[PDB]
Every structure is written in structure tokens, then in C-alpha cells.
Amino acid sequence: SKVFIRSAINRVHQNSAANGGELPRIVFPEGTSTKVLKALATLVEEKICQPILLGYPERVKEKIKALDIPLLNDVSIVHPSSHPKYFSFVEKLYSLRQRKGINLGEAERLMADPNYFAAMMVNQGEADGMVSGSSINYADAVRPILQTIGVYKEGIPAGLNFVLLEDKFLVLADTTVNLNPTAEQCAQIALQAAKIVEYFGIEPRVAMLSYSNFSGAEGTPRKMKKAAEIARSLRPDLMIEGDMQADTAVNPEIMERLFPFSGLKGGANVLVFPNLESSNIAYKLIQQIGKAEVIGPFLTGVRRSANVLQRTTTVDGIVNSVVFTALEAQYIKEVLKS
Amino acid sequence: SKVFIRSAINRVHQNSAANGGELPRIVFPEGTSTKVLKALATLVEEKICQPILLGYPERVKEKIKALDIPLLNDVSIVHPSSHPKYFSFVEKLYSLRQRKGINLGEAERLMADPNYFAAMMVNQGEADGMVSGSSINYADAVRPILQTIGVYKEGIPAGLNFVLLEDKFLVLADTTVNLNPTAEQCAQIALQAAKIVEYFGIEPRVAMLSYSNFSGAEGTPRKMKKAAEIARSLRPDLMIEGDMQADTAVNPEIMERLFPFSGLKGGANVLVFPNLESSNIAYKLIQQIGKAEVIGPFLTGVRRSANVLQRTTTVDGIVNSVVFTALEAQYIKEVLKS
Amino acid sequence: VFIRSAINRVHQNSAANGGELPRIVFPEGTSTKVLKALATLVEEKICQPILLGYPERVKEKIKALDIPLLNDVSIVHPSSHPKYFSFVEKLYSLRQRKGINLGEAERLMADPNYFAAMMVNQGEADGMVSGSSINYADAVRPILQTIGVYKEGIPAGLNFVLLEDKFLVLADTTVNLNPTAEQCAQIALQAAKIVEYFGIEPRVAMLSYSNFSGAEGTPRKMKKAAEIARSLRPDLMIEGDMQADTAVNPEIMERLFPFSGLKGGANVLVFPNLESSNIAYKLIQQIGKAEVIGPFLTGVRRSANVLQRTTTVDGIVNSVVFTALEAQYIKEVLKS
Amino acid sequence: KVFIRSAINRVHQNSAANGGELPRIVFPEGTSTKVLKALATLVEEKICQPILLGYPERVKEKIKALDIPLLNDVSIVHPSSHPKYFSFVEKLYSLRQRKGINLGEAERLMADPNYFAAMMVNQGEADGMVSGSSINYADAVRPILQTIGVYKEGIPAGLNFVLLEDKFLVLADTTVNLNPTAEQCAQIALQAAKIVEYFGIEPRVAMLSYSNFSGAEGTPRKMKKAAEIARSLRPDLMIEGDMQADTAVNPEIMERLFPFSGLKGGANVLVFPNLESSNIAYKLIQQIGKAEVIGPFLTGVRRSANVLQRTTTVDGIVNSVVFTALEAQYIKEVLKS
Amino acid sequence: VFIRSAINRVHQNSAANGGELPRIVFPEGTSTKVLKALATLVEEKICQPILLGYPERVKEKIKALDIPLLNDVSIVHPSSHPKYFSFVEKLYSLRQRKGINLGEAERLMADPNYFAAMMVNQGEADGMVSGSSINYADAVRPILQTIGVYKEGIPAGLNFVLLEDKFLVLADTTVNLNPTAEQCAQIALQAAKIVEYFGIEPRVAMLSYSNFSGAEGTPRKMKKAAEIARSLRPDLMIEGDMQADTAVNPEIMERLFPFSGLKGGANVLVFPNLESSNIAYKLIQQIGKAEVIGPFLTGVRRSANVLQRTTTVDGIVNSVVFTALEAQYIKEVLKS
Amino acid sequence: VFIRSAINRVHQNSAANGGELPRIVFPEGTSTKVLKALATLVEEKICQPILLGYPERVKEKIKALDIPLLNDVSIVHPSSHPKYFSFVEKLYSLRQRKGINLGEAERLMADPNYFAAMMVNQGEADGMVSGSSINYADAVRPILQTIGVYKEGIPAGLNFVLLEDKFLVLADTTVNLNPTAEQCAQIALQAAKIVEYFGIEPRVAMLSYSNFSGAEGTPRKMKKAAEIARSLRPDLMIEGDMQADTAVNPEIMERLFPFSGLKGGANVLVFPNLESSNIAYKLIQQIGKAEVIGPFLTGVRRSANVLQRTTTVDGIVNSVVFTALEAQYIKEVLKS
């Protein structure tokens, strides 16, 4: 139940040791959020990250005392408009977005907000990653990240969750960003999810989900059939199939008995959804009524390490999410050193 | 999870004993379907129904003997084109659909098909219910039912599934029929699911699911917020709320902590979905990877007793589905004693 | 005139290779008008008919109708035929990513229309004729799903209007609700080829409610259809957009639109939508004083034709003669 | 030809009840060869008094080149020099001043024979008009619709008669509406029915489709609904649809295959789903059937005005003018009621 | 002249009301042009200004600009104001079914634009003026979300063109991209009532690129807007569709369109889309010889105006004078 | 002054061509304001006017107006012109697949607007000026159908605002309801070349209600129009999306958007739709205190301009002076 998460913690430790013992600097814009602070007590004990809290230092240190969490007494607290880099950060956002309606006045007002300040910190290398969204809706938390840090080349911003089963994990995407991805977008989501599965030493086997089995009819069935064709043309080395129903996808015996002509054998471990209603409802329902741990969402497709929590998260969910944000920050920091 | 199903079995028996010992006559158009026949061995042993098989008697009896299946030697096997009521049934389908493109030629050709013949048997009272779809896709199996038996007044054809948890069940709909139901259709689906929950002695508490919490924004959030408003005016005695995410819906602690203004307290036990992708994927994923039994889909909104299996069903799934079809057939047969 | 030469043309083909008559399967084994027509067709050695149905029910109808020549016609019940499960597997193989698994294939192959289409596809018959008792959409769907269209073809119905110096070809009278400019050009090329098979020069008009207006909508569409077809067959006279009397009357064309590329009157009329084609051929047939034969299904890989359900017995006879000709043509193409 | 001779006799019969005066029919195409040749017959048969529009010199020159003596004293009116010209300009302006027609536009339009003819009819200086022999239908019909307009709940629609051996068939709308709605197809049907009743015949109406009683999305559903709407407005008539064209006209096909239908004995009024189907059908029947087809006749408009098909023969013009004369006489009676 | 009369009504209003001046909050406490304008406005007893920001950095800007009269001005930092958490709760109460929970409400209320809107909404200020340093959309959204539109109202920007003998009103210059006919009628009525407050008879033109054409698109929309508005205020001259020179020039209208119901020239011009209204007032402002004041936000429940970010120091002075007038009018309405 | 310099260049062009004056045909031979304008224009040796109409009714209007220099003006009645039937054949030749047969061609060619257009097309006149009496759409349609656009040209109206230090050019003020980004760039290039003919460097702003936002709709379209135009004339300053005051005021541009490629103020303003351009130039003309001349039709193969029907007499004089300049320029390009 816990095995995949403690293997992640152990990989964070191996990465820290291979780099002087340094921990990733993870900035939290919600410096007074009760669940973030309670989670950070566990995370600092486990040497997962060096946290940076954003807010008015007096009020963050007020909240830490009311919650009685001494292990954070040293933790750095930064008030955005008083940080020495504020004016350079204002200038950078203006430079990036002056033809997207951000003049100096808009940049100045946005950079005062902790979410924008956290995103620019990560973009500029003043932090290695960020974790936000514990106290506000996903759209408002993710917009600063997409506008500031942006997507890498050909990337698509997309949320991913792991369902931690007994044999294996299953990856679900896109659980957070795209309302109704096109066939081309679902293929790119599949490739992004696939390289994450490969990072963990697993063979990705991809199903494009629908309410139909290999019907190819207009609408969602046709879209997910074409998504699988596009993804296969970009990664012909992977098993990728669709359109198919969700039990057809995960159960190898159903697949073999009913659709043995299919190219997907042994059950899918990457499930790509046709719309945001389906992915968002599915991972949340599994999390609540299944008997498996679900971790995420993790934001993929973006140039730097940045993750948005689901606002319904528990304290333990934040701990799990920061562990994988630390792993992502370490990976990206090593890419930026080659 | 065996308790909710064994209680249904005992209610089928109590209904039979309260009516002369009659068992409900359930017709199965797929007379040679391996899983249907294996299921019927258990269903006859458990005195759930009088099964009627459709097909060529020697091909059906050959399959029963090749599978070594007892208790089916007395079972009625009917070939549609040789049944005495065939031409009357042709006459009736023409009468019903002559301005929908069904002349006598079309009616004769359709009525030779077991799925069409089974539906007319139920419509005309020659059977008390039917169960189909073990060997063909849902759209093709459900179309004869909707075209022949049709919806009751203001009903909407809609599939419903039960998730049987340890302390409660959850109802999911519409898992099979409507691709993208309107706000008005999602209210009617909720009302149909609510009356099913009440038949089992439980108070229904209804959530209109979205990827959003009380955002009411254009698109799905607005549709599901409005669907809850319509349903509240139609059943002002019930807790009905939306738009909300799936974990907000089922977890009473999340709702109270984050949205205490909501009218839904104590957790939803009826989940109404915004489109068929989300509902169909969700119940199949829960069934495969959750550790709870999922029964259904059950076709609601139709004038007579008729259910379509998921073609991915197991034999035990068919046994479970027929138990509840028997209950529906007994209930409708007793309403028709007015 | 035109029909008797076609009948002789079937006999000419039979003698030339094998001596065998084309095997034509009729899925509607109990259809009264089909059975009455087959009395004439067997007497004239047009085809070896294969009827689909329950043998005893088909034999009751033949006896009840008192038709003597059908005493030993072959009658086949789909589910009992030795090739039934082979046909089921083939349909699954063809359509498994179009929603047809083995369960769907078994259910469909028990239906005579599907079984007839597969018999022809597999070479167990040389052609089929259906649609005497059901609507065209339901009769043609199994053919298109099983046999399919040839490379770059478009399924399209074609009718012949038989005047005294002339025949006119009308298309597409049955399939496409609202064909695009590209589709109307392809329909034109398919019709032009049938006309050439009968030794006639095809002269094609893309019909509209307009004369060379080129305005948005149907006029622009039919103007472009003629341009596309001209680029694909630069050797033919093809013109549009033009009205129907402009198209067929060489005098109106010369007097009012001498700049047009179509002179001497069109004998191939391509229609802009299915309302116009379907109503027009049926009205000419009923109230005109010319015989109309067809519709004939063009663009498909094997020989298969769907009757209009309003057909007379004599209309079935005419349709089967040309189905036999198509079957012989395709069957001889399929050796080389 | 029986049906045409009976119409000719009713024009004379109507003339006898009013002093012997003939309807004044204006022809804007004063130099059109086929119009002039047709008028020689029409003046001979006392169908109408024609009024030609143009330059008197060019019109009388053309009459002389074709050697048609019976037209050497027909009235010729040049729009811009006629005494009512400035009055006509003011009227078109008064009618269309919030439809983009000012005094400048009205002066320019009224100088054109088609507009001048339409206004002559609108103002009672003529009893009817016939145009469209030399220009496309759209340009000929637009001045009529803009000047005279539709009567209340009316719809502009062209109608043709197929004169069979023992009935006529009415086809509509063969000229105006590209793609009428179900509601418009109902109104076209009612307009055609009242014309059929004028000739002493019972109207039996079919809404044509490529389908028989399918009711499927698109044209089948539209023509099924057109029949329902029209039936509610004239519950005394047989009106049915959707149905195919041979189903509609052949009583034996209808009785054999669709005995539940409300249309028995065959339709004599065929209402078409779009302009492609109606325009092609009447032209093809006219060219290749062996029945006479007369029209199109413009229905739904407040005064008598018809537009010929530009492909017309001289005898077609003669046939069309006879029924325009009848229409002109009918409207002149109502305008005294 | 029109401006001295507005100032002078603010003064009469302040008189007879204890000497009280309207409390106007400016969220942009460090904005150079806002501070420079306030030197003139407090000097002239127009308003008691409240500046939002970090007090220490606002006084820093005031000293750099050498404005000694602003030393005693009230400066409020949103997050430390005693009512801050009360304001958070109010926004949550208003917008909890529009996606604003306590977390969102608390984050938004820390922003000066949101804090100013709530101050006005709760009666802690009598009006607000924003938008000198950020785009109009970002400045107006908090006002629309917090204060909202009154019943049947439409949010719409309005400008006055102050000519020598008269003023012209233009709307909607800021809010609606492409108003419907119904919205353009409601905009006309809102502007008409403002003109009546200044003692003038409103004469309304619905502007288009066409004169009385009524053709599909913009001509039909503006013809219909005038018909709708005429039915709601039949006592007023309201006409359209018409071009802009037809609208303002009584001689052109009389010479070319004497049938029109608009005589004596329009003084209210309602535009068909935001491109036309926004470009028009700015171009007249830059190259004409007339003063243009505004835009003024109409249709909202309390006094709140958004500057054009291109404003001069005089523009801000002009705008605040009329915001003060609006604030005083509203405060009396809320006194019954 | 700008107009007086134009008149002098007409004379300088005339002197260099043997003293010949351009032949300008006016289809509105009886239009009061045209006739009064021609009194000034013939006195100023601007053009040789040709009036269309009935020679008797035209001379009847001239004498009643008392215009002595018009005594020997050429007056042409289209149906009586010796080239009439040649012109009918030419219009038929051009448009026979656009719905114009010989009958339509005869009827249209009898209309002065069509006849005036064909005279210019065939070289029987050097230019035409119409639209004093009728709406712009009806006046411009014959020109576009007969003369047409030069290759890749776009028909577009242009107006000059004659300011004190400079002029501003506005387009497209008359033709395109809602030009695409690609069309807006082409309008910019045409306007740029006219400004260069007057010896001035064009600086182009793509106008919007937004400043450099690039948001969907008009902002994105005008940002993209500027990008396309820059790639076609990399030597010019061309920028967008921007508001109208940002565009014309160099101090606003430098203070608020110094990253912009446009410095020193735009003198060419390209509008996003016809509502904005048409209302703007008419409002500036009526309530600004600067003269506005035009509209002038650009993008067409020959010299032809449509007046605004609301024009004054002095406006027609101004318009004809520049039509004369265009006619003279075009005649030496056609001597290649």
C-alpha cells in the first residue's frame, strides 16, 4: 500500500546523496494553509525538501505556533513585495507577457500575489519546484504556472494520477487541465504519461478509453481510435490501443477473450481519458471508495517543476504529492545541468 | 457484499410464495450464449425465474449438452419464426412503427430476430421480463427494447449500477444510454434513481457530478448546477445538490469542511453523471479495481421489465443481474394488477 | 429495343465462357413479385436463381402462386448452410474494428440480406438482387458494409430513361443525400463509364435550378463538379451549372448559352441532391410515357442491386437482366 | 389542350360580364422576339390588351422587322417619359424608405421596365404583368416581390400544371423558395389547394420526399411535419407525407403498400421539399414526358404578375398569358368587393 | 462650462449636507497621475480620498512628487484593515456558488481593486475610481463581481463630448463587445436617464454603417434596437439604423430622411459594437477640438468608475468630479 | 493647403500631357450637387466632365441651375450611344458564367452606373465619380463587377483627415464588413502606397479596443494583421493590436508601450470592421474641426470613386480633384 511511496522517498535520498546532500527548494505560496504546514512537519523530518513559505512572516509564524509545530521554526518565510528580487521579477513577467496584455502595472499587481511570485521563483531558479492549490480551485492555481513557466516544446499541460494497486500501479490522465482534448492532444498526453512510467522502470501499455469497444463510430469512439493511431505512429515501440471500455482496458482476460485481435496484451497501466468529466470523476471516486491509494494530480508537460494539489486533499495527500515534486525537481535540475 | 444480493434473492422467493408460487417468465434471446446458459443452471437451482430461451431447439439443446448443464431439460426453447404468435407479433410491430419506416416487410424481417422477438414477447405479456446483451454491444441490444416497449410517461431510458460497499450502496446513472444528457434529462435520471433507492428502504441523497465544485461556470458546471435546481423543485423532500466533484459528493467530511452551505449532508448515495464517458468508465473501473461488488447496469425508464447486460459480464454477473430483473418483473406484474 | 439486346448480350456471354448462367441470390425468397418475376427469368435463361429462406415456406409460396418453372430452384436457409460459420468469421474479420465481434456477426449472418451479401463477396454467388419488400437504406446497408466500394468509387444509384432515339442516365438516385462537388464529379465518371459500355458517347450535365449563375450554394457546387470532372476526363463534354431543360434540349442550349461546352444535348444527368434525383426518376416513370429501368448500384466491388420497393413484376425482370450483365462483366474481370 | 381551351373560354366569358373589355397586361420586354410572336396569337384570340414597355421607336422597329401587323397600334410606354413616372417614384420611396430605397434609388429603379411594370399593376394602371422571357427568374421576380408584395400569411411560390390525359397535376414551389421549412411547405400546399378548387377539382396533397413514412431526421421529418401542420389548417382535405413521388401519384401503390395513409385515390398536388427537386422535375417532365406543362405561375402575391421561364417557347408564352389574364380578371373582382 | 457646473453641484450637495464630502477610495495608491490629480481635487473640496497600499511606500511616492497637500491623506492596506476578514466573509457569502470559497475570497480581498469594490459595496466608501495603471477588463471585473448591476441594468461605459453649444453622449464605449438589439435599447435608456439628470432632452440615434436600410446584420440589429427602445420610452425621439453624420447633423437628416422620427440632431449615440465605440471616443478626444470626459460606468448598483489607462492628469480630475456627483446622488437614494 | 497643392499637381500633370484634362464620367447627370460642383471644377480646369442621362433633361437641369460653363458639356444617353451594343457584348463576355446573358447585359447596360463603369473599363473615359444620389453598395457594385480588382488587390475605401500638421489616413471606411487578418494587411499596404505617393513615410496602426493583449477575436486578428503586413513591407513601422489614442499620440505610445515598433505616431489607421471605420470618419468630419476628404476607392484596376451620399457640394469638388489625380496617374502606368 505504502511501497511505491517509500521507494520514491528512497530515490529522493539517493539523489540528494549524489549531490552533496542538498535538498530541493520547494516554495509553497500558501504559507498559512493549515494542511500544508502540518504536512511540512513530516516532510522536513524525512529530509525530502527545503521548504520556502510565502506570506507575511509575522502571520506565518503566528500560525505555526497556534498549530504547535516547532520543526518549522527556522523555515524561510518570504513576503513577495519585500523580497530583493521583486522588481527583477516584475520586469521578467512584463518581458514575457507584454504582448499578452501584461504591462508594468499588471505585472506589478500580479507579482504581489504569492501564486505568481512562486511561479516566477521557480522559473528564475530561485526555487527548484513549487506546490500550490491546497486552498483554492485548480484553475486559479494553475493559471500562474502556465502563464509564467509555460509548456515545453510540443508539450501539453495535463494532470496525471497514480492508482497504487497490489501488483502494479495504474496511471490516469488528463485528470485536471483539458476539458475535451482532441485526438492529437490525447496522443500527446499518452506519450507524456508513458515517459513517466518508463522513469519508474515499467513498460507503459496505453489504452485510449471510451464508452465503446473498437466501434470507431462518430464522436468519442472515433476520437480515441484516432488518438491510438497517432500515438502508435509516434511510439511504435509501445502497445497502444483504442477505442475501448475501461474494464476491457485493465482486465487482460476480458481483452483476450473478446478482442484478441487487439495490440494491447497483459492489461493497460496507462489510461488516457476522452474528457475532463471522466478523468476527474474517476480518480476521485477510486480514491474515496476503492481500497487503493491514489497520488496526484501531477502536472505534466511544463518546463519546470510545479504541481497543483486537489483542494480536497488530506494532510497525508500533501505529503505524498511533495515527495514526487521533490523527485521531479531533482530530475529537472539535472537536465538543466547538461 | 453477498448480503445485499442474498436479501434480493429472499425477496424474489417471498414474492413468488405470495403469488401461488409463480416464478417470473424471463426470456433470453441469446439461447446459445455460453455464459447465459451457465448462469441459468444457478438461477433455476435458486428458483429465481422460469427461463425461456430463443433459438433453434437442436442448436440450443446441443450446446446445453456439450456444456453438461443440468436443470435445463424442461426449459422452453422457442424459435421466433415458428412461434404461433409470430404473425400477430409482426402485425403489432407494424401497427406501432408504420410511420417510423416499418412496413410489413420490415416487421417480418425484424421479428425473426430473437432480440426483437423477446422485446415483443414482453410487450404483449407472453413473458414477464427479458435479459439480453451478453454477446452483442449495448446499442444493438437496447434498440429493440426502446423501439418496441418504449418509455413510460415522462421517463428517460437510463442505465443504473449499484456499488455495494460495506455500510451502504451507491447508485450510479446514467451508465449506458444518453451520450450527453441535458440538465432536464439529468433531473429525470435522478428522480428515476431515487425511486429505485426508496424501493430498498433507503433515503436517496443526490449529487449532480462535475469536474467543478459550485462554480456554476459555462458548460458542464452550469448544466449540473441547473439539473440539481430542477430536481429539487420536482422532489422538494430530498437532498439534491450540484455542481460538485465526486469526492465532495461521497465524503461527508469534505462537504462539511469545504462547502457547509450545501444542501447535501451525510454523503450522496445517488451519483448522476454529466455524460456517458464519465459514467461508463467510472462504474467499470470501480468494478475491476475496487474491492466492492458492482451490479448492473439496470435499464430504468422503460414501460416493461427488460435489461441489457454489459457484454463484458462474468457468469456471476449474469446471475446477479437476473435476480434484480426478477424483482422488477414481479413488481411491474403486481402494478398491472390494478 | 434496349432490353432485348441486353438479354441477347447475357446469352452471348454465357456461350462465350463456361455455358453457365450467372447465379443470382434473392434474399427475399417468399416475396410474391420476386417469385413471379423468376418465372420469366428462368424461361429466358437469364440467371440461375438462389432463393433464401425456410425451404418449406418458400415451397408453400411457390405452390400457392401456382408457378411451375420454380419446382427445382435452389432454396438456402442461412443458418443451416454449410458455409454459415465461415461467413460469420469473415464478417468479423472485416468489421472487428467497426463494432462487429463474433456475437454481432452471428446475429447479422442469420439475416438473409447479410447472408446474400456475403455469398456474393465470397464467390458463392455471382450477384444479388434485394429490396423488393423493405426500404432501400435497410437493403443497401449490408451490401456496403460487406462488399464495399472499389478504390475511389462512390456508392450511387443509376437509372436509365429509354426514349426512342435515346436513353438518358440519371444519378445518384438512391444513396447520397447531398453529395459534394467532388462526389458529383465521381458519380459523373461512374455514369459516363456505364454509358461507354453500351457504345454511347457520354455527355454530362451537372443539374441545378440555375443556368451558369455560379452563385453560392447548389449553383457553385455544380459548377465546380463539372470543372473537377472535366479535369479528370478532359476528353468528354461535361458542363454546369445548368437547368434540366437546358441540359437535355440541344436547341435551348445553342440558342441561349452558346458559350457552353455541351452541344447536342446531355445523356448523363448528375443531380445535386437525393430529393431531386429520387423524385425525378419516379415521376418520369409514372407520368412520363417512357420506360425507366433501375436503380442500379454503381461504385461497389461486386454485383449487387437493390430494387425500389414500389417495383412492378416487370421492373424486377428488367433489373435482373442488367444485374446478370454486371455479374458476367465483373466475373470475367476477376480472372485477369 | 382541353384544359387550356376551357381556360380561354372563361377569359371570354369573364370579358362578356364586363362590357367586353380585355385585361390590360403589361410586358416590360417590349422588344422580346418570343413575346411579340406570342402576342400576335393572343391579340387574335382576344385574351388581353397588351401594353409594351420600351422606346416606341425601337419597339415599333422590332414589330416591323418580324412582320407582325396586328401589333402596329399596341400601346408602348417609355417609363421615364410617362406622366405617372414621378408619382410612381414617390410611391416606391413611400413603400421602401426603411428598406434602403430613397428618392435617388427610386428614380433609378423606376426607369427600369420591370420595376415600372410592377408599379403600374400595383397602382391600377394595369391589370397584370408578364415578364422573364429574356432574363433569369430571380432578377425578374425581385421587382414584383418588392413592389406588389405578398398578401397576408402568403408565401411567394411558383406553381406548374402537368396536363395529363384525365387529370392535371399541380407542382410547387417550382421557382422561389430554395429550402422551405415545414411551415412554408404547409402554406405552399394551402395556396395550391385553393387554386385547384378554383378549377372545380378536389385537392389531394402529398408532401414529397425520398422516403415513405420514415419520419427520419432531415427531409423525411420536415415533410411529415408539413403534412401534419397543413392537415390542422384544412382538416377537410386529404394531405399526407412524407412519401415518395410514385407512392404519391399512383393510387394502386399507395393502397398496396401504405393502406394506413390518409391519401386515397392519388395526389393531384405535389409539394416539393427544395427548389432543386421542384425545378428539375417540372422541366424534365416538360421536355421528356409527352404531357403539356404550363407555368410557372406566381402565387401568394397581392396583384396579378407572372414570370416566365426564360427557356419558354412562343406557345408557352401564349399558354402563360391566358392564365395571367384569368388571374387578372379574378383579382379585379375581389378589388370591387 | 459643463465641468464647472458639475463641480458646483458637488459643492451645493456638500453644503446642506453638513459640509461632508464623498469618500472616494483609489485602489492605486502609488499611481503618479492619480496622486497629481488629487492635489487639485482635495484643493477644490470635491472628495475625501482614501488611498490603498502599503502606507510607507505611498508616502514615499507622495514625497517624490512634491505634493505637500496629501500628507494627512488616509492610506489603507487591505490585509491589515480591521474589517478585512469581515469583507472576506461577505464576498464568500455572495459568490460561494460562483466558485469563491473562503480561500479564494481571502486571496482576492487582499488585492486593492477587490478591497475598494467591497468598501463601496459595504458603505465604508461612497465611491471608487480605478484603472489608471491596468487594463479596463481587469479593473472592471472586481466591481462587476462585487457590486453588480441593478435590476434590468446593463454595465456600459459612457462618455460626454463637450462641444460649444451642446454635449454628445456615446455608449457603450467599454464593456459589451457586440451588444444585442435588446442590450442596445437598454444602453440607450440608461444614457437617456443620465442626460435628463443634466436637464437636457435626450434624442437617441442607433448607429450603423447604413441609412434606414434594415439589411441583415448590423443594420437590422440597430433598426430593431430603436424599435425596442421606442416601445419602452415612447415619449423620446429614438431612431435607427443610421450613419453617424446623418445622426448628429439635423440638416442632413431633414434633407435626405425627413420621414425619420429624429429631428434637431441626436445628442445620444448608441454604438453597434465595442470596436466602433471605443475607437470613436478616443479619436475624437485626440484630434477633435472638444473635451471628452469619461468613460463613466453605468448600470451598476453603487458608484464606481474605471479610468482609461491612457488618461491625462486632467482626465482623472474630470472623472472624479462626476464620480463624486454620482456618489452623492446614490447616498441620498439609499436614504429612503 | 493640402487640397490646393493637389489642384496644382493636376495642372502640372495636365501641362506635361499637352494640356489635356481627364475625362470623368458622372452617371448622375441630373444630380443637383454634382452639377453645382462641376461649375467649380471646370472653372479650376480639373476635368472634362461627361454627364449621363437624357440630353434634353440634363440640359433642362443645367439651365435651371444657371451654370454657364456647362453649356458645352458632353451629355450621353446610354441606350443611344454608338458603342452601346459593343458594351453589352463586353459585359456578357466578362460575366456569362456569373449569371449575365445577353438579356441581362442589355438591361444593365441601359443603366448609367453600369454604362459609366464600362466606359472607364474600355477607355472611353479616364475615370468616373458616382454615388451622390444612391447608397454606396448600389453604386460600387457595378464598378466591382465590370472593372474589378487588380491582382491581389482588395476593394477598400480610404479617407484623409487633414490636420494642422499632417494628415491621417483611415481605411477601410466603405467596403468590407469584417475583414480578415490577411485582408487587413492588404488594406494597410494599399493605404501605405497612397501615402508614399504624397511623399510621406507611412506608419501603420492596426486598431482595436485593446492594447497589445492578443486575446481571441478582434485583438488577435489585428495583432496578426500587423504581423502579416510587417513581413510584406519589412521597411515600414507597422504595429497592433492597439487603441486609437495609443495609435495617434506618440507620447502615450512611448510612455506606456515603449517595446512597440511604432514611434512618432501613426498616420495610417486600419480598422477592424466597417462599423468602426464608417462611424469614425463621419463623426470626425461632423464634430471635429478638421476637414475630411473621401472616401476614395482603392484596389480596383481603373479610376472610379463613389461619393458618400451625404456629401456637400464642396465635398464633391474635393473628391473629384483627387479622382482627377488618380485618373492621370493610371494613364501613364498604362503606357508601358
Author numbering:
A (entry chain E), B (entry chain F): 439 to 776
C (entry chain A), E (entry chain D), F (entry chain C): 441 to 776
D (entry chain B): 440 to 776
Can you quote the paper on this entry?
We generated an N-terminally truncated mutant, MaeBPTA, spanning residues 439–780, and determined its structure to 1.96 Å resolution. The structure reveals a departure from characterised PTA proteins, forming a hexameric ring with D3 symmetry. The classical PTA dimer29 is formed from one unit from the “front” trimer, and one unit from the “back” trimer, giving a triangular array with dimensions of ~120 Å across by 60 Å deep. The PTA fold can be divided into two subdomains—d1, composed of the N and C-terminal regions (residues 441–595 and 738–776), and d2 (residues 596 to 737). Together, the hexameric assembly unique to MaeB has two isologous interfaces (isologous defined as the same face of contact, d2:d2 at dimer interface halfway along the triangle edge, d1:d1 at triangular outer corner) and one complex heterologous interface (d1:d2 at the inner corner of the triangle). HPLC analyses confirm that this protein construct predominantly co-purifies with the allosteric regulatory ligand acetyl-CoA. Acetyl-CoA sits in a shallow groove formed between d1 and d2, placing the bulk of the ligand at the inner corner of the trimer. A pocket formed from Y576, T614, N718, Y721, K722, P735 and Q748 surrounds the acetate moiety; a single acetyl-binding residue, Q683, is provided by the opposing monomer of the dimer. An extension from d1 (residues 524–550, forming a loop with two helices that we term the 3′ loop) sits over the 3′-phosphate group, interacting via residues R535 and K538. The central pyrophosphate region of acetyl-CoA sits flat against a region of d1 (labelled “face helix”), making an electrostatic interaction with R581. A loop from d2 interacts with the adenine ring; residue N616 hydrogen bonding to atom N6.
Bacterial hybrid malic enzymes (MaeB grouping, multidomain) catalyse the transformation of malate to pyruvate, and are a major contributor to cellular reducing power and carbon flux. Distinct from other malic enzyme subtypes, the hybrid enzymes are regulated by acetyl-CoA, a molecular indicator of the metabolic state of the cell. The larger ME isoforms (hybrid enzymes) are predicted to be a fusion of two unrelated enzymes; a catalytic N-terminal ME subunit and a C-terminal phosphotransacetylase (PTA) domain. The PTA domain is homologous to PTA enzymes (that interconvert acetyl-CoA and phosphate to CoA and acetyl phosphate), yet they appear to lack critical catalytic residues and thus acts as a sensor instead.
